[PDB]
Amino acid sequence: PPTEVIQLDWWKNCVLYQIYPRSFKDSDGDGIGDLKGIISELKHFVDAGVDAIWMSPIFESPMVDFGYDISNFYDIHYEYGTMEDFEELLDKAHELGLKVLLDFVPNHASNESEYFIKSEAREPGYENFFIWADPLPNPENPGVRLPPSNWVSQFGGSAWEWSEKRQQYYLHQFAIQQVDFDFRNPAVKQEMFNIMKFWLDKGADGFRLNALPYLIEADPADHEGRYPDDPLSGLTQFESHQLGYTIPLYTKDLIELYDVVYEWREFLDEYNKNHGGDTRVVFSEGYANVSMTMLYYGNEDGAIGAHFPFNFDFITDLSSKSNARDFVYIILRWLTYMPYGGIPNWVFGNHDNNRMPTRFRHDMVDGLNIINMLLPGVAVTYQGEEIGMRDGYVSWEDTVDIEACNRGDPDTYHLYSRDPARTPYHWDNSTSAGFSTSTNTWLPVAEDYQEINLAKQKETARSHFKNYQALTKLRKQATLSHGEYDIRALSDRTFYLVRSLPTHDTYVLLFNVSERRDTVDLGRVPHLTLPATVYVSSIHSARLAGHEITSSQLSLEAGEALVLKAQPI
Amino acid sequence: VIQLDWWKNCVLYQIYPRSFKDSDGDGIGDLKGIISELKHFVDAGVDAIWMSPIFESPMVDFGYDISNFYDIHYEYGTMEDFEELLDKAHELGLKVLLDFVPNHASNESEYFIKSEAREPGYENFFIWADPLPNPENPGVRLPPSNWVSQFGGSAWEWSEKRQQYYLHQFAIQQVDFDFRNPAVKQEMFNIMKFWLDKGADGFRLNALPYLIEADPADHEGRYPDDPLSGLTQFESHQLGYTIPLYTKDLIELYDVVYEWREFLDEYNKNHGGDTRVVFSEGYANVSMTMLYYGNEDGAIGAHFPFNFDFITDLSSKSNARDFVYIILRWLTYMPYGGIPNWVFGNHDNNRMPTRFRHDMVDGLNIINMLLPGVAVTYQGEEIGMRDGYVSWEDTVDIEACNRGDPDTYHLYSRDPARTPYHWDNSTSAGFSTSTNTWLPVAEDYQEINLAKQKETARSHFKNYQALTKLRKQATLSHGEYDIRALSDRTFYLVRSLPTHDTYVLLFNVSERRDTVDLGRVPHLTLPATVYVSSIHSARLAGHEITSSQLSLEAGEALVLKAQPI
Ligand SMILES: OC[C@H]1O[C@@](CO)(O[C@H]2O[C@H](CO)[C@@H](O)[C@H](O)[C@H]2O)[C@@H](O)[C@@H]1O
Ligand SMILES: OC[C@H]1O[C@@](CO)(O[C@H]2O[C@H](CO)[C@@H](O)[C@H](O)[C@H]2O)[C@@H](O)[C@@H]1O
Ligand SMILES: [Ca+2]
Ligand SMILES: [Ca+2]
Ligand SMILES: [Mg+2]
Ligand SMILES: [Mg+2]
Ligand SMILES: [Mg+2]
Ligand SMILES: [Mg+2]
C-alpha cells in the first residue's frame, strides 16, 4: 500500500508568491494598486494553489524607490491604504489558510524618516544611527572637498552625500534618499528587533530581508582612521560615477553582516518559542557568489541564519542562451553547495529583473513553472509568471525607476530600468487589463494583455494558469513533498527531473529547452516504467493531459515540456 | 560484465621525453632512456603512454616547433630507437601514442621555406597577409590585425623574403598552417598514416582550439580585429588584451577533427588489431570542449577531449563542495556514451602537489583512479613530484622568455613542471649520470624519488600501484558513482555495483580536522576495511573502520572496501 508520510512544516515546501502591490490590483481608480485590491483577490492565491504571499514594501514611503525608501517602518503607505486595511488583509488571508510575509528593509531609511531627521541634527540617541564621515583631508588643494572614499552607489554617483546642516557626508549605497544605518550601533540593531516584533505582533508570518550584502562596510578603525577606497575594476567602459568602476571589497559581503542575520534568527527562534502557532520565518535577499550566499543559512561553527537565502540562479546564470546541460548544472549548484538539512528554493523572477518568458522564450513558460514546482523545496512565483506575463514596453517618458533615471538616458535607460517587470497585472481583457477601471495607470499596461490575461486562461481549455494549478495541486502528493529527486541531461536539448518514492506514483519532467526538436530514449529515465500518462503538457504540446506514452522513443518540439505520471517504484 | 575496449578505462601516462631518462649523459632525456624504463609502466599499472613531441625540431618550444614531421629528433635518438621503443612497449602490453602538432610547423620546416619562397603548391600552406598603412608614422607598417600570440606580441611576423606577414598563434618560429587549404589537410592524413603504419596506437592532438581563424573573404578582404578585453592590466602586446573571437574555437575547426576520426575509423577497419585512438588537447569552455567528442547532428570526433578541470578550476583554494561541483561538470556535460577522463597535470602547468598541497597527493591520485573512465597521469604525479626551482638564468621556456622578465618570468614559466624525473638519490636523481641537466633537478630529490618510495612500507607510489590494481575490479570498470560533500572540508565518492564490493573515497581537502557521520554515505555499511590511506593517515591498509563518526586530519584520504550493495 502507499506509505503514510508526516506533513512538512509549512515553510519547507510552500509555494511562495511575490506580490508587487503597486501593480497587482487597483480598487479605487487612481492607477495605483492597493491593499483593498489585494484583499479583493486573496481568493486568487487559493485558486492558484499558493501557500504564502510576500508583499514588496507597503510602509510609509516618499516612493523615490517605490517603497524601499521607508519614512515610517510602523505604518502603511497612504496610496496602498491604512493599518486597518492591513489588519483586514492579514485576517482575511489567515482565514483562507494563507501565510503573509512583509518586505523588511533593514539596510537603509528614507531621508524623510524621523531616524534621519534626528541623526542629521545630532539628536542624542540618533547622531550615530547612520554612517557619517568627514571629507578626506586634501592638503594638496585645501579649498577642494573630497568624499571619504571612491565608493559608488548601486544607483550611480558617489555613495557619499554632503549634508550642509551636519557638515558631514552620509553613506547611501542606494539613492541619495536611502541612508545606510550603522549596523555597528547596538541602538540600530535593537530598532530592527523592535520593527520585526511590531509586525509579528500584528500577525505577520515572517519577512523577506532586503539587500543584506550591503549591511556593513569597512570600519575606518581598520584603515588608519579613513574609509578605504574600494579597489578599481580596471574596466575601460566605467568612469568613477558609474557602477562597475569599483570592486565592492569594503562595501559588500562583509563577514560581520552574517552575525546580524544569525542575531535576527536567534530573536525569531525566541519569538516562535514564546508565541507558538505556526513558525514565523525569514527569507534573505542577496545577490552574491555561492559561498557568500550559503553563509545566510548558517556556518560550519553551528550558526543558524535565514530559513533560506533566495536562489537567484534562474535569473543570474540561465537564460534563452542556456542548453539542457546548463539547466542541470545550475540546478546542481544549489543542491551541491547548500548545507546539510538546508531547504532548497527556486526563484524565476522578481520586481528587479526581466520577466521569466522575456529572459527565456514565450514557448518555455510551462517547462519553467514545472521546474519550479517539481524541484525539491520551495517554489517562488513572481506576480504574472502563473499566466506567462512578458516585460511591458516602457518609454523613457513613462520610466519612473530611480535606477534608470539615475544611471540612464533616452539611449541607455532600458539597460537599467526594472519598470518593464512592474507593469500592471493582466486580470482580463477589460480597460487596463482589469488592473484598474481607469486608462491612467502608474506604469503602462503591456500591449499584449488581450492575448495574455488570467480570465482568458481560466476560460480556454489549455493555459499557463491551468498548468500552474495542476502543478501546485501535484505538490500535495507525497512524491513531491517527500520523494527523491534525480536530474540529468538526455542531450544538449532535453533534460529529465524525476520525483520518486517507494509505493507512490513517479512523476517525470521532460523539457526540451532548445530551439530544435529532440528525440530521446525514455529507457534512460530512471524509475520511468511505460506505459505512462501525461499529467501536464505545455500549452502547444501534441500531447493532452491523459495522453498515454507507450513508445520508448519520444520526440519533443522546441520548448515542449511534459509531466508524466508512472506506476510506483 | 562485457570487457571494455582498452582506451575506455586505460591509465594513460604522459611522458615528457626530455626530462624522463637520459641514457647517454648529455643531461637530455632520450628514447633509449624511455626503453630502459618501460618496465616502470608495468610496475605502476599504466596501460598506455603518450610522449610529448619527439620529431625533428629546432627545440624553440622543445618539440612543438617541428621541422620534419616524419623523423626523430637527433638529441632523443633515431627512427631505429623509436621502432625498438614501440616493439618493447607492445611486448610489455603497453599502448603508445604520439604528440601530433597539426596547428603549426617550425619556420625551419621545408613546408615553410617552400611557402615563403612561393614554390608552387605551397604558396597557401600558411596564413600570408598584407600590411596595413600606419596612422601616426607612414613608414612603420601595421599588421593585418590586432591579434595577440599566446606567447606575447603580435600573432603576425613580417617575412623580408615574401614581403607579407605570416600568422603565428604560438612562437614567431611556429607558423600556422592554412586549414582551408585541402593540400594542408591531405598532409595531415599523410603524417598520421606514416606513424600509424610504424605501429603507433594513436595520437594526442595539440592546440586544436587554434586550428582556424576568420576568413578575410567574410570581412571584405581584411582580417577582423579581435574584440578588446578592456582590462587595464593588459597592454596591446600582452595575452589578455583581446578576446579571441576570430582566432580560437571557430566551429569549422571541429569539422577537421571529425574528418580525422573518419580517416582513423577507416584505418582501424582496414588494419584490425587494437583500436588506434585520438585524444584532443584544447583549453576552452565546457560547451566548446564537448564538441570535440562529436555533435548532436551525429558527427564523431576524438575518442575524448582531455578534461583539464583539476588544472583550471580546482586548487589549494578549493573546498569539498568545489571539488564535487567541478567533478560534476564533465559528468553533466559529456554526451551519452562518452568516456570521462581526468587530468591532474601536464608539461604546461604547475605540478599537482604545488597547485594543491603536498598532504593532498594521495587523495588526488585516488580521485583520478576511482572516478569513472580514464585516469591521466603526468610524469612525476605517481611519486608526488613538486615544481622544481628554476632561476631566470636557467629558464629556457620561450613562453617565460617572451612574456616575462627576471621579476615576472615565474608567472609564465612551464619549466618548474619539466625538471628531470626523480628515479633515485644518485647524481641528478638518477635521470642522468651527468650533473649538467637541460633543466636543474628539483632540490628535494633526496626526499622525493621512486627508489625511496619502492622501499618504504607506505608511499605515494605504493598507493598509486594499489589504485591502478583496484581499477581491474568490476566496481571501478562498470560500477555506478555517487559523489557529495559532507561538509566544506570533506567529500565522498562511492563506486557500487550489485554483488561486487563497494569502494568509498573519503577526502578531507581542507587544512583542518573534520569529523563526519559515515551514516550519511550511501551504500557504505560498517565494518569496512581501509584499502588505501594517505601516507600521513593514522589508518593503515587492513585497518577496520567500525564507528560511524570519522575524524579525518588535514588532507587525509581513505579508500574503504565495504560489502556489496
Ligand atoms: O537593482 C536593484 C539592486 O538592489 C537590490 C539589492 O539586493 O534589490 C533590492 O534592494 C533595493 C534597495 O532597497 C531595491 O531597489 C530593490 O527593489 C530590492 O529588491 C538588487 O536587486 C540590485 O542589486
Ligand atoms: O601555455 C601553452 C599554451 O599552448 C597550449 C595550447 O593547447 O599547449 C600546447 O600547445 C603549445 C604550442 O604547440 C605548446 O607550447 C604546449 O607545450 C602544448 O601542450 C596550452 O597549454 C596553452 O594555451
Ligand atoms: Ca549598509
Ligand atoms: Ca591556426
Ligand atoms: Mg489604487
Ligand atoms: Mg538591474
Ligand atoms: Mg640523453
Ligand atoms: Mg600557463
Instruction: Tell me which ligand sits closest to the C-alpha of residue A33.
Output: 5
Judge whether B487 is closer than 8 Å to chain A, CB to CB.
Answer: yes
CATH number, domain at B303? 3.20.20.80
- B237 and B306 belong to one structural domain: no
- B334 and B398 belong to one structural domain: yes
Number of helical H runs and strand E runs in chain A = 15, 23
Q: Mark which of A251, A269, A294 sits at the end of a domain.
A: A251
B146 found inside a domain: yes
Specify the long-range contacts of residues A268-271, CB closer than 8 Å, at least 24 apart. Answer: A268/A196, A268/A206, A269/A304, A271/A196, A271/A197, A271/A200
Q: Which amino acid is at B38?
A: L
- What resolution does the deposited structure have, in angstroms? 1.9
A507 found inside a domain: yes
Q: Mark which of B402, B436, B464 sits at the end of a domain.
A: B464
What 8-state DSSP symbol labels residue A380? E
Identify the helix (H) or strand (E) that includes residue A521.
Answer: strand A518-521
**Total domain count, chain B:** 3
CATH number, domain at A548? 2.60.40.1180
Instruction: Name the one residue in this structure whose C-alpha cell is 580596471.
Output: A234
- B512 and B553 belong to one structural domain: yes
**CB-CB contact of A379 with A488 (8 Å):** no
Residue A60 pairs with which residues in a beta bridge?
A72
Binding site of B for Ca(2+), by residue number, is 103, 176, 210-211, 213
Q: Mark which of B193, B223, B248 sits at the end of a domain.
A: B248
A529 found inside a domain: yes
B436 found inside a domain: yes
Determine if ligand 2 sits within 6 Å of the CB of residue B170: yes
Nearest to B296 among A328, A491, A524 (CB): A491
Contact list, A232 vs chain B (CB under 8 Å): 232
Q: How far apart are CA B174 and CA B156, in angstroms?
A: 11
Q: Which atom of ligand 2 is nearest to the CA of B347?
A: 17
A453 found inside a domain: no
- B505 and B547 belong to one structural domain: yes
Q: How far apart are CA A248 and CA A236, in angstroms?
A: 17
The residues in B 232-261 lying below 8 A from A, measured between CB atoms, are 232-233
The three-class DSSP label of residue A531 is: coil
Q: Which residue of chain B has the CA closest to A299? A: B488
Distance in Å, CA B104 to ligand 4 centroid: 7
Instruction: Name the one residue in this structure whose C-alpha cell is 530559513.
Output: A307
Q: How far apart are CA B399 and CA B415, in angstroms?
A: 10
Full residue range of the structural domain in which residue A510 is found: 483-566
Q: How far apart are CA A510 and CA B412, in angstroms?
A: 47
DSSP B5-51: PGGGS-EEEEE-HHHH--SSSSSS--HHHHHHTTHHHHHHT--EEEE
**CB-CB contact of B428 with B437 (8 Å):** yes
- B520 and B387 belong to one structural domain: no
Sheet of A132-133: strand order equals A132-133, A168-171, A160-163
Nearest to B325 among A232, A336, A491 (CB): A336
A52 found inside a domain: no
Distance in Å, CA A352 to ligand 1 centroid: 7
Contact list, A333 vs chain B (CB under 8 Å): 325
Contacts of A120 (CB under 8 A, 6+ apart): A163, A165, A166, A170
The three-class DSSP label of residue B98 is: strand
State the nearest Cα–Cα gap between A103 and chain B, in angstroms: 31
- B490 and B405 belong to one structural domain: no
CATH number, domain at A232? 3.90.400.10
Distance in Å, CA A533 to ligand 3 centroid: 53
Residue B259 pairs with which residues in a beta bridge?
none
- B71 and B208 belong to one structural domain: yes
The three-class DSSP label of residue A132 is: strand
**CB-CB contact of A162 with A169 (8 Å):** yes
Nearest CA to B379 among B424, B342, B421? B421
User: Residues in chain A, how many?
Assistant: 569
**CB-CB contact of B565 with B529 (8 Å):** no
- B430 and B444 belong to one structural domain: yes
- B429 and B490 belong to one structural domain: no
Contact list, B333 vs chain A (CB under 8 Å): 325, 329, 489
- B291 and B341 belong to one structural domain: yes
Judge whether A493 is closer than 8 Å to chain B, CB to CB.
Answer: yes
B221 found inside a domain: yes
Residue A484 pairs with which residues in a beta bridge?
A500
Contacts of A544 (CB under 8 A, 6+ apart): A462, A534, A537
What 8-state DSSP symbol labels residue B126? B
- B414 and B386 belong to one structural domain: yes
Q: Phi-psi region for residue A341, left (φ > 0), alpha (ψ -120 to 50) or beta?
A: left
What residues sit around ligand 3, an ion, with C-beta below 5 angstroms?
A 107, 180, 214-215
What's the Cα-to-Cα distance from A247 to each of A126, A150, A251, B449, rounded to whole Å? 31, 11, 9, 45
* Lookup: cell for B153: 606580441
Contact list, A497 vs chain B (CB under 8 Å): none
Nearest CA to A39 among A19, A61, A59? A19
Experimental method used, please? X-ray
The residues in A 98-157 lying below 8 A from B, measured between CB atoms, are none
Count Cα neighbours of A95 within 13 Å in the Cβ-side half-sphere.
9
A533 found inside a domain: yes
**CB-CB contact of B385 with B377 (8 Å):** no
